[PDB]
């Protein structure tokens, strides 16, 4: 129920963020480029990352209003990563619509991603903050940007091989999703506080939430009911996607199981999909990943303890808790 | 001969620029990503853009040394555009080597371009300049970045059609190549001078040189001797590339000629290539573009008149003059 109100707040902030986003990427020449760029932002994303920005600036000092363009920067960066990643992953349809590359082609999709990335920094420039703050915000966003490319690169290398280790996958996801999430919180703080203890606490919360997010999604993809998930379980198995669940299984399973799993991994199909999920349960792999996600969530909030009590800290605690309780 | 010394200077500055470039993109994890990113920079580009930066800061105030990272930013941006553009243009081999996408694949090439773009801004952040200057440099680079994507987008749309107008092609090239060149000079000034008259003069010189560069290359591609060009003339004709020469021809040629040119445009071949170049000469199209390039060169230098006499202004005048006299 409170989640309903939390989403009420989240959706409330989204409005401010959205006006800024679309004033940066309006319908102008060239349109094909700007509509291609506008496609994902227009899908009506919930703007969780920007929300973490503005909400983080309130858990430390106040006036998230000054963290609007920097929050926009982060949402623009997130969107550009989706466009390019969809090209690489060969993703057919984001949301209930075709992906940017399928509609406008790979070349225009690359350019749209580029435009989106470029405008994240134009958003960073438009920020209204002290030179020292600005300089420190630009540098947080840049380092997260680099980690993001590095995490996606390691993710591409995985394709060159059948198995991965828990350590390999965690180093990859940390930069793919964790980095930008951490940057969201860390940038929120910086904009409203000079308390290095808060920032270190906000950063740790973003890092952990960003990672647990994805891990929980991978978990849901296997054991979430189809009807509700809108689709059958195990599409990540059919995809041969490297998740923490699959890494745990490869680390713990005997040769016989490993080899059978690999036959029916990333290759009627109802039987093979289930036989694969059964192989994973045999070794507690799904449950394992579920626990890791919950622990990171606990550690994240238990790190916000350091900040004062406000409804802003409240939302950050609720969000983190929601991100791991949902189906 | 003086060109030999100019290139001696250019190559002299390249050293400083190169150390900074490779400290930003060193051989680190992940390597496949960082070598893919290092591939074009390692080709030993002459760093003309960065040279314009440091040289421009000397034509106004002095101490180009403080314009090193901002110059690096621009060279990193130029390099990322080459990687992505090569993917789009289906370019087989830059220089005497394979392109990034052919060696590492399209996905890793996209990521390499992304990393290169991200590190341009990490270079911008590392700059050692007053907050006001920094903020104004970041904003010049961002707007040129946006123009660059816009110019490349319009260039992609051209493929959707057989003919283009002189106006269409100039609006496209202006952002593709002109913008970044203008930014190179404009950013040089800003770093060393608060004279808005210099900056407007430097900017105008960069814009014009950047555009004339490309126009002269297209001219050479047709009428430059093969032996010397290292290859036969008219590969742009076989490519069906939209240049100012082709735009002038489509604007001036009669229907009969238009239609024949289109048959043998972007499609033994020695005869068709020559028949196409002959069609262009009939209407003065090649000569036309040559003159436009020379005029822009004259206008560019005649705009540097405003700055004091130094050897820095000297090099900027020589470079502009070289860019249009070479073969
Ligand atoms: Br399990
Ligand atoms: Br001619
Ligand atoms: Hg990336
Ligand atoms: Hg671009």
XYZ file of C-alpha atoms and ligand atoms in Angstrom:
658
model
C 0.000 0.000 0.000
C 2.739 2.426 0.985
C 4.378 1.239 -2.219
C 1.376 2.773 -3.940
C 2.250 6.085 -2.314
C 5.977 5.635 -2.979
C 5.155 5.156 -6.655
C 2.956 8.211 -6.252
C 6.012 10.193 -5.212
C 8.254 8.611 -7.820
C 5.692 9.440 -10.506
C 5.433 12.929 -9.012
C 9.146 13.623 -9.496
C 9.080 11.989 -12.945
C 7.081 14.958 -14.260
C 9.822 17.499 -13.537
C 12.447 15.169 -14.921
C 10.452 14.481 -18.062
C 9.954 18.131 -18.975
C 13.731 18.633 -18.861
C 14.420 15.473 -20.837
C 12.160 16.439 -23.707
C 13.389 20.008 -23.879
C 16.862 18.558 -24.448
C 15.597 16.058 -27.032
C 12.676 17.816 -28.769
C 11.152 17.068 -32.170
C 13.643 18.980 -34.310
C 15.921 18.539 -37.315
C 16.896 15.965 -37.904
C 13.642 14.381 -36.706
C 14.381 10.767 -37.614
C 17.373 11.088 -35.308
C 15.461 12.900 -32.582
C 12.456 10.566 -32.663
C 14.769 7.574 -32.627
C 16.446 9.161 -29.603
C 13.045 9.974 -28.061
C 11.686 6.454 -28.572
C 12.828 4.860 -25.301
C 12.382 7.997 -23.145
C 8.793 8.200 -24.511
C 8.107 4.613 -23.499
C 7.255 6.184 -20.147
C 10.071 4.751 -18.037
C 9.512 5.206 -14.310
C 12.734 7.227 -13.881
C 13.934 5.280 -10.838
C 17.527 6.447 -11.295
C 16.644 10.156 -11.440
C 14.342 9.576 -8.457
C 17.318 8.269 -6.515
C 19.174 11.433 -7.439
C 16.578 13.957 -6.230
C 15.634 11.754 -3.277
C 19.292 11.401 -2.294
C 19.775 15.155 -2.277
C 16.920 15.327 0.227
C 18.294 12.665 2.549
C 21.367 14.817 3.069
C 20.574 18.520 2.749
C 17.482 19.429 0.741
C 16.217 21.151 -2.394
C 16.417 18.314 -4.899
C 15.352 20.993 -7.360
C 18.986 21.830 -7.986
C 19.713 18.192 -8.816
C 17.263 18.112 -11.735
C 19.607 18.404 -14.745
C 22.211 16.099 -13.175
C 19.425 13.565 -12.608
C 18.363 14.076 -16.212
C 21.945 13.378 -17.296
C 21.824 10.026 -15.591
C 18.486 9.068 -17.169
C 19.834 10.066 -20.574
C 22.910 7.921 -19.982
C 20.741 4.994 -18.915
C 18.665 5.384 -22.081
C 21.640 5.534 -24.422
C 22.936 2.301 -22.876
C 19.616 0.625 -23.628
C 19.704 1.609 -27.292
C 23.246 0.371 -27.867
C 22.841 -2.718 -25.696
C 19.693 -3.685 -27.583
C 21.709 -3.632 -30.803
C 24.262 -5.960 -29.271
C 21.875 -8.296 -27.447
C 19.775 -8.527 -30.610
C 16.785 -7.501 -28.466
C 13.613 -7.641 -30.517
C 11.253 -5.491 -28.450
C 11.679 -3.316 -25.383
C 8.463 -2.851 -23.470
C 5.550 -3.649 -25.762
C 7.210 -2.041 -28.767
C 9.989 -2.692 -31.291
C 13.547 -1.665 -30.365
C 15.203 1.443 -31.797
C 17.508 -0.490 -34.150
C 14.675 -2.572 -35.623
C 12.581 0.510 -36.403
C 15.276 2.883 -37.670
C 18.067 0.428 -38.405
C 21.365 -0.252 -36.662
C 23.201 2.832 -37.965
C 20.545 5.336 -36.897
C 20.224 3.467 -33.574
C 23.942 3.857 -32.948
C 23.628 7.581 -33.683
C 20.551 7.902 -31.436
C 22.495 6.317 -28.587
C 25.337 8.762 -29.324
C 23.004 11.740 -29.274
C 21.485 10.581 -26.005
C 24.984 10.250 -24.464
C 26.016 13.686 -25.726
C 22.904 15.265 -24.291
C 23.543 13.713 -20.852
C 26.600 15.956 -20.696
C 24.720 18.897 -22.079
C 22.367 18.306 -19.158
C 25.358 18.179 -16.814
C 26.547 21.534 -18.142
C 23.142 23.223 -17.646
C 23.256 22.326 -13.937
C 23.064 25.232 -11.473
C 25.669 24.379 -8.849
C 28.978 25.633 -7.371
C 31.996 25.058 -9.671
C 33.498 22.622 -7.175
C 30.265 20.635 -6.959
C 29.773 20.664 -10.730
C 33.323 19.480 -11.324
C 32.828 16.666 -8.813
C 29.493 15.645 -10.372
C 30.902 15.538 -13.908
C 33.684 13.280 -12.634
C 31.329 10.850 -10.898
C 29.222 10.537 -14.022
C 32.281 10.063 -16.204
C 33.733 7.272 -14.078
C 30.377 5.487 -13.956
C 30.146 5.921 -17.720
C 33.525 4.207 -18.167
C 32.550 1.360 -15.783
C 29.328 0.894 -17.722
C 31.229 0.364 -21.016
C 33.679 -1.920 -19.189
C 30.903 -3.983 -17.647
C 29.159 -4.347 -20.977
C 32.483 -5.300 -22.629
C 33.071 -8.099 -20.125
C 29.490 -9.156 -20.761
C 30.262 -9.466 -24.474
C 33.375 -11.581 -23.819
C 31.198 -14.078 -21.916
C 29.656 -15.058 -25.252
C 33.091 -16.387 -26.245
C 32.661 -19.134 -23.675
C 30.160 -21.547 -22.084
C 30.791 -21.119 -18.331
C 31.545 -18.190 -15.998
C 32.458 -17.859 -12.329
C 30.538 -16.086 -9.589
C 33.462 -13.675 -9.453
C 33.368 -12.985 -13.185
C 29.667 -12.310 -13.235
C 29.762 -10.015 -10.149
C 32.616 -7.970 -11.591
C 30.570 -7.533 -14.771
C 27.205 -6.686 -13.254
C 28.883 -4.304 -10.825
C 29.808 -2.029 -13.696
C 26.887 -2.725 -16.019
C 24.104 -1.727 -13.628
C 25.674 -1.106 -10.214
C 27.898 1.791 -11.280
C 25.139 4.025 -12.638
C 22.913 3.305 -9.679
C 25.692 4.183 -7.257
C 26.342 7.362 -9.242
C 22.667 8.290 -8.930
C 22.772 8.263 -5.128
C 26.315 9.591 -4.861
C 25.497 12.530 -7.123
C 22.354 13.232 -5.155
C 24.310 13.604 -1.946
C 27.124 15.738 -3.376
C 24.551 18.240 -4.626
C 23.139 18.768 -1.165
C 25.819 17.801 1.361
C 29.528 18.080 2.142
C 29.424 15.163 4.573
C 31.754 12.523 3.153
C 30.160 10.007 5.497
C 26.712 10.466 3.995
C 28.040 10.251 0.447
C 29.915 7.046 1.247
C 26.691 5.686 2.691
C 24.530 6.803 -0.237
C 27.058 5.429 -2.731
C 27.155 2.043 -0.973
C 23.363 1.909 -1.055
C 23.201 2.707 -4.769
C 25.873 0.165 -5.640
C 24.145 -2.594 -3.683
C 20.628 -1.773 -4.877
C 21.729 -1.512 -8.498
C 23.263 -4.978 -8.351
C 20.496 -6.677 -6.343
C 17.912 -5.255 -8.788
C 19.284 -7.177 -11.681
C 19.928 -10.342 -9.652
C 16.303 -10.364 -8.493
C 15.104 -9.892 -12.082
C 17.098 -12.919 -13.165
C 15.564 -14.852 -10.257
C 12.023 -13.821 -11.193
C 12.647 -14.756 -14.813
C 12.937 -18.378 -13.723
C 10.564 -18.878 -10.842
C 8.003 -16.154 -11.389
C 4.614 -17.452 -12.457
C 4.067 -17.152 -16.198
C 0.560 -15.696 -16.223
C 1.752 -12.884 -13.953
C 5.175 -12.475 -15.573
C 3.217 -12.091 -18.804
C 5.346 -14.903 -20.204
C 6.776 -18.373 -19.550
C 9.721 -18.852 -17.214
C 13.302 -19.544 -18.274
C 13.700 -17.180 -21.275
C 17.124 -16.402 -19.806
C 17.895 -20.126 -20.091
C 16.866 -20.169 -23.730
C 18.937 -17.029 -24.120
C 21.944 -18.585 -22.458
C 22.232 -15.430 -20.328
C 25.040 -15.298 -17.753
C 23.380 -14.577 -14.416
C 24.511 -15.147 -10.817
C 22.264 -18.214 -10.744
C 24.035 -19.818 -13.697
C 27.452 -18.882 -12.268
C 26.613 -20.562 -8.955
C 25.423 -23.666 -10.789
C 28.565 -23.981 -12.920
C 30.643 -23.533 -9.770
C 28.850 -26.249 -7.827
C 27.472 -28.810 -10.287
C 29.079 -32.193 -11.101
C 30.316 -32.901 -14.623
C 27.319 -34.950 -15.649
C 24.912 -32.161 -14.758
C 27.144 -29.390 -16.203
C 27.270 -31.114 -19.573
C 23.559 -31.814 -19.780
C 22.728 -28.273 -18.708
C 25.010 -26.977 -21.452
C 23.211 -28.965 -24.125
C 19.897 -27.351 -23.212
C 21.395 -23.927 -22.399
C 21.213 -21.010 -24.850
C 19.985 -23.357 -27.595
C 9.760 -29.822 -26.996
C 11.349 -26.783 -25.359
C 9.022 -26.776 -22.335
C 10.723 -29.987 -21.189
C 14.298 -28.751 -21.715
C 13.592 -25.431 -20.020
C 12.182 -27.226 -16.981
C 14.955 -29.822 -16.967
C 17.399 -26.884 -16.860
C 15.638 -25.107 -14.014
C 15.545 -28.413 -12.139
C 19.302 -28.760 -12.552
C 19.690 -25.305 -11.011
C 17.442 -26.058 -8.021
C 19.320 -29.280 -7.340
C 22.281 -27.146 -6.261
C 20.338 -24.325 -4.575
C 21.529 -21.922 -7.289
C 18.268 -19.977 -7.553
C 17.832 -19.699 -3.769
C 21.517 -18.755 -3.530
C 21.100 -15.728 -5.815
C 17.868 -14.754 -4.047
C 19.733 -14.592 -0.725
C 22.618 -12.603 -2.144
C 20.125 -10.068 -3.465
C 18.326 -9.817 -0.112
C 21.587 -9.467 1.792
C 22.759 -6.620 -0.443
C 19.385 -4.975 0.129
C 19.776 -5.355 3.890
C 23.328 -4.034 3.749
C 22.243 -1.091 1.592
C 19.516 0.175 3.920
C 21.595 -0.689 6.998
C 24.035 1.791 5.461
C 21.479 4.599 5.281
C 21.122 4.332 9.047
C 23.861 6.947 9.174
C 21.591 9.594 7.651
C 18.903 11.436 9.616
C 15.298 10.303 9.683
C 13.277 11.827 6.887
C 10.665 10.619 4.418
C 13.395 10.827 1.807
C 15.488 8.228 3.587
C 12.144 6.487 3.982
C 11.536 6.234 0.241
C 15.110 5.066 -0.357
C 14.517 2.302 2.164
C 11.135 1.385 0.747
C 12.424 1.342 -2.844
C 15.317 -0.924 -1.919
C 12.902 -3.183 -0.067
C 10.417 -3.163 -2.945
C 13.055 -3.944 -5.509
C 13.523 -7.305 -3.750
C 9.980 -8.238 -2.648
C 8.138 -7.732 -5.909
C 7.290 -10.402 -8.463
C 59.563 23.409 -47.481
C 58.078 25.479 -44.677
C 55.370 22.829 -44.706
C 58.136 20.452 -43.696
C 58.799 22.650 -40.678
C 55.081 23.133 -39.985
C 54.715 19.354 -39.898
C 57.782 19.409 -37.679
C 55.884 21.578 -35.221
C 52.658 19.631 -35.587
C 54.549 16.398 -34.927
C 56.266 18.139 -32.013
C 52.965 18.923 -30.283
C 51.609 15.458 -31.133
C 54.015 13.946 -28.589
C 52.495 15.783 -25.622
C 49.007 15.021 -26.844
C 49.788 11.357 -27.372
C 51.142 10.773 -23.874
C 47.880 12.118 -22.431
C 45.746 10.096 -24.823
C 47.356 6.800 -23.918
C 47.302 7.443 -20.194
C 43.529 7.818 -20.531
C 43.225 4.692 -22.691
C 45.983 2.352 -21.444
C 46.247 -1.418 -21.851
C 44.007 -2.433 -18.955
C 40.999 -4.607 -18.154
C 39.151 -5.163 -20.203
C 41.942 -5.235 -22.798
C 39.902 -6.289 -25.825
C 37.877 -3.144 -25.208
C 40.904 -0.956 -24.564
C 42.899 -2.246 -27.537
C 39.863 -1.845 -29.757
C 39.622 1.717 -28.441
C 43.386 2.206 -28.885
C 43.395 0.883 -32.456
C 42.715 4.135 -34.330
C 44.667 6.400 -31.933
C 47.648 4.016 -32.405
C 47.422 4.331 -36.175
C 49.571 7.411 -35.606
C 47.108 10.109 -36.650
C 48.740 13.503 -37.133
C 46.542 15.151 -34.469
C 45.639 18.164 -36.614
C 42.603 18.992 -34.476
C 44.527 19.019 -31.181
C 47.232 21.044 -32.946
C 44.618 23.648 -33.794
C 43.668 23.731 -30.134
C 47.143 24.360 -28.685
C 48.094 26.588 -31.617
C 44.903 28.614 -31.190
C 45.638 29.225 -27.528
C 48.956 30.715 -28.630
C 47.482 33.018 -31.255
C 45.484 34.721 -28.525
C 47.280 34.610 -25.177
C 49.858 31.860 -24.721
C 50.726 28.715 -22.786
C 48.999 26.079 -24.893
C 50.160 23.745 -22.143
C 46.939 24.388 -20.269
C 44.922 23.401 -23.338
C 46.367 19.876 -23.458
C 43.526 17.804 -21.947
C 40.842 19.823 -23.758
C 42.745 19.188 -26.996
C 42.926 15.521 -26.054
C 39.153 15.533 -25.547
C 38.666 16.706 -29.089
C 41.000 14.064 -30.546
C 39.185 11.392 -28.551
C 35.864 12.657 -29.886
C 37.211 12.639 -33.434
C 38.395 9.053 -32.963
C 35.110 7.792 -31.558
C 33.326 9.271 -34.583
C 35.637 7.328 -36.881
C 34.899 4.018 -35.178
C 31.128 4.435 -35.296
C 31.105 5.989 -38.760
C 33.182 3.114 -40.112
C 30.510 0.713 -38.870
C 27.856 2.679 -40.708
C 29.786 3.376 -43.913
C 30.800 -0.288 -44.033
C 34.414 0.922 -44.292
C 36.727 -2.017 -44.837
C 40.096 -0.551 -43.856
C 41.192 2.731 -42.323
C 44.776 3.587 -43.123
C 46.584 0.422 -44.171
C 44.780 -1.703 -41.601
C 41.376 -3.292 -40.966
C 38.691 -1.187 -39.252
C 37.773 -1.653 -35.592
C 34.447 -3.381 -36.325
C 35.996 -5.899 -38.730
C 38.664 -6.923 -36.215
C 36.611 -6.996 -33.010
C 33.103 -7.109 -34.439
C 30.339 -4.517 -34.571
C 29.282 -4.808 -30.913
C 32.769 -4.333 -29.471
C 33.352 -1.522 -32.000
C 30.245 0.274 -30.783
C 31.499 -0.076 -27.203
C 35.000 1.121 -28.171
C 33.480 4.225 -29.740
C 31.453 4.706 -26.536
C 34.526 4.378 -24.352
C 36.410 6.848 -26.516
C 33.518 9.354 -26.224
C 33.316 8.893 -22.454
C 37.027 9.461 -22.079
C 36.863 12.719 -24.081
C 34.813 14.086 -21.194
C 37.084 12.543 -18.632
C 39.815 14.493 -20.408
C 37.661 17.621 -20.223
C 37.273 17.137 -16.474
C 41.039 16.742 -15.879
C 41.631 20.168 -17.457
C 43.361 22.775 -15.274
C 41.406 25.960 -15.932
C 39.165 28.534 -14.183
C 35.624 27.239 -13.459
C 34.150 29.773 -15.874
C 36.539 28.732 -18.641
C 36.006 25.027 -17.969
C 32.238 25.434 -18.030
C 32.473 27.314 -21.328
C 34.789 24.683 -22.847
C 32.540 21.777 -21.852
C 29.630 23.579 -23.510
C 31.479 24.193 -26.777
C 32.484 20.553 -26.984
C 28.969 19.394 -26.179
C 27.332 21.521 -28.865
C 29.871 20.378 -31.455
C 29.228 16.809 -30.334
C 25.491 17.238 -30.969
C 26.119 18.845 -34.398
C 28.406 15.957 -35.287
C 25.639 13.382 -34.610
C 23.170 15.598 -36.494
C 25.466 15.942 -39.486
C 26.070 12.215 -39.603
C 22.303 11.582 -39.288
C 21.552 13.794 -42.287
C 24.324 11.953 -44.094
C 22.547 8.657 -43.421
C 19.217 9.995 -44.731
C 20.925 10.815 -48.048
C 21.151 7.073 -48.692
C 17.339 7.050 -48.838
C 17.550 9.014 -52.068
C 19.499 9.448 -55.327
C 20.043 13.233 -55.529
C 20.882 16.014 -53.049
C 21.117 19.797 -53.250
C 24.143 21.991 -52.647
C 22.261 23.317 -49.632
C 21.581 19.851 -48.240
C 25.158 18.730 -48.567
C 26.598 21.940 -47.012
C 24.251 21.713 -44.038
C 25.419 18.128 -43.511
C 29.155 18.609 -43.909
C 29.004 21.705 -41.720
C 28.114 19.556 -38.743
C 29.953 16.373 -39.690
C 33.435 17.877 -39.972
C 33.092 21.658 -39.675
C 31.685 21.690 -36.140
C 34.544 19.814 -34.481
C 37.130 21.824 -36.352
C 35.503 25.078 -35.291
C 35.380 23.785 -31.717
C 39.107 23.043 -31.872
C 40.002 26.656 -32.651
C 37.251 28.171 -30.522
C 38.320 26.131 -27.502
C 41.927 27.089 -28.070
C 41.100 30.769 -27.865
C 38.821 30.550 -24.819
C 41.622 28.866 -22.880
C 43.986 31.751 -23.465
C 41.901 34.853 -24.191
C 38.807 36.780 -23.113
C 38.632 38.693 -26.390
C 35.308 37.769 -27.974
C 36.594 39.184 -31.246
C 39.491 36.747 -31.412
C 37.278 33.791 -30.536
C 34.777 34.750 -33.229
C 37.676 34.945 -35.656
C 39.227 31.643 -34.569
C 35.835 29.918 -34.688
C 35.153 31.204 -38.215
C 38.551 29.928 -39.322
C 37.972 26.471 -37.849
C 34.510 26.182 -39.364
C 35.741 27.162 -42.821
C 38.895 25.037 -42.727
C 37.019 21.997 -41.448
C 34.576 22.204 -44.341
C 37.100 23.033 -47.083
C 39.260 20.090 -45.920
C 36.646 17.563 -46.777
C 35.606 19.302 -50.008
C 39.213 19.262 -51.220
C 39.511 15.560 -50.353
C 36.461 14.802 -52.460
C 38.024 16.837 -55.283
C 41.331 14.972 -55.050
C 39.519 11.644 -55.024
C 38.411 12.333 -58.586
C 41.179 14.249 -60.273
C 44.223 13.257 -58.266
C 46.631 11.040 -60.162
C 46.240 7.377 -59.254
C 49.890 6.433 -58.799
C 50.275 9.277 -56.300
C 46.852 8.866 -54.682
C 47.910 5.255 -54.172
C 44.721 4.267 -55.975
C 42.505 4.919 -59.004
C 40.281 7.982 -59.161
C 36.517 8.018 -58.654
C 36.102 5.593 -55.705
C 33.605 8.138 -54.373
C 31.665 7.669 -57.622
C 31.634 3.912 -57.186
C 30.620 4.562 -53.601
C 27.826 6.883 -54.619
C 29.107 9.354 -52.006
C 27.262 12.674 -51.672
C 29.880 15.386 -52.114
C 29.615 19.065 -53.094
C 30.730 18.069 -56.591
C 27.836 15.649 -57.031
C 25.384 18.172 -55.543
C 26.497 20.835 -58.028
C 26.133 18.368 -60.891
C 22.606 17.301 -59.924
C 21.676 20.972 -59.602
C 22.977 21.923 -63.033
C 22.790 18.871 -65.304
C 20.053 18.204 -67.903
C 17.777 15.186 -67.522
C 19.605 13.042 -70.031
C 22.906 13.461 -68.218
C 21.353 13.123 -64.722
C 19.814 9.781 -65.622
C 22.929 8.345 -67.214
C 25.074 9.516 -64.316
C 22.674 7.794 -61.931
C 22.993 4.478 -63.728
C 26.762 4.496 -63.266
C 26.676 6.135 -59.811
C 27.108 4.114 -56.606
C 26.775 0.865 -58.577
C 34.251 -2.525 -67.483
C 34.179 -0.127 -64.537
C 37.101 1.999 -65.763
C 34.848 3.230 -68.578
C 31.831 3.995 -66.365
C 33.957 5.765 -63.769
C 35.483 7.978 -66.456
C 32.145 8.550 -68.178
C 30.858 9.760 -64.787
C 33.769 12.104 -64.159
C 33.316 13.451 -67.685
C 29.669 14.193 -66.940
C 30.798 16.176 -63.897
C 33.401 18.204 -65.812
C 30.861 19.050 -68.496
C 29.106 21.243 -65.927
C 32.203 22.561 -64.125
C 31.152 20.658 -60.989
C 34.667 19.623 -59.959
C 36.147 23.087 -60.588
C 33.140 24.573 -58.779
C 33.864 22.647 -55.565
C 37.583 23.421 -55.860
C 36.805 27.153 -55.899
C 34.418 26.952 -52.974
C 37.137 25.229 -50.968
C 39.740 27.858 -51.894
C 37.372 30.712 -51.098
C 36.603 29.307 -47.647
C 40.347 28.989 -47.101
C 40.860 32.611 -48.129
C 37.993 33.743 -45.921
C 39.334 31.719 -42.988
C 42.830 33.213 -42.990
C 41.472 36.661 -43.890
C 39.614 36.267 -40.594
C 42.776 35.632 -38.583
C 44.009 39.039 -39.702
C 42.358 40.323 -36.542
C 44.855 38.492 -34.331
C 48.401 39.724 -33.705
C 51.356 38.529 -35.735
C 52.942 35.443 -34.255
C 54.300 32.158 -35.573
C 51.186 30.573 -34.124
C 48.933 32.596 -36.389
C 51.546 31.719 -38.990
C 51.039 27.973 -38.620
C 47.254 28.386 -38.659
C 47.597 30.250 -41.939
C 50.025 27.750 -43.401
C 47.891 24.762 -42.365
C 44.786 26.268 -43.930
C 46.773 26.994 -47.075
C 48.291 23.508 -47.119
C 44.966 21.821 -46.635
C 43.952 23.227 -50.041
C 47.186 23.051 -52.079
C 48.168 19.462 -51.417
C 47.438 16.474 -53.632
Br 17.088 -23.265 -5.732
Br 35.198 20.582 -63.742
Hg 28.872 1.866 -22.923
Hg 27.758 11.027 -33.423
